[PDB]
Amino acid sequence: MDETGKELVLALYDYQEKSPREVTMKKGDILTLLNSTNKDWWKVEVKITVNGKTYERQGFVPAAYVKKLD
């Protein structure tokens, strides 16, 4: 969450990540739309705080389970 203010998306339904490349989202979660070239698999970025260290990473998720903020 670097207040990029570019492309934000809100999750409507719950989802889980099967691979280390994907990301786990839940109904009400906010993700940073990095790549929306696809219609089924959307590439979003999330923030993971580990050991007091904020980490960034982009993963694929079901667009049908989420929506665009604007």
UniProtKB/Swiss-Prot annotation:
It comes from the Eukaryota. Residues 4-70 form the SH3 domain. It is found in: Cytoplasm, Cytoskeleton; Cytoplasm, Cell cortex. Morphologically, spectrin-like proteins appear to be related to spectrin, showing a flexible rod-like structure. They can bind actin but seem to differ in their calmodulin-binding activity. In nonerythroid tissues, spectrins, in association with some other proteins, may play an important role in membrane organization. Belongs to the spectrin family. Like erythrocyte spectrin, the spectrin-like proteins are capable of forming dimers which can further associate to tetramers. Interacts with ACP1. This is Spectrin alpha chain, non-erythrocytic 1. It comes from Gallus gallus (Chicken). The chain holds residues 965 to 1025 of 2477 of the full protein.
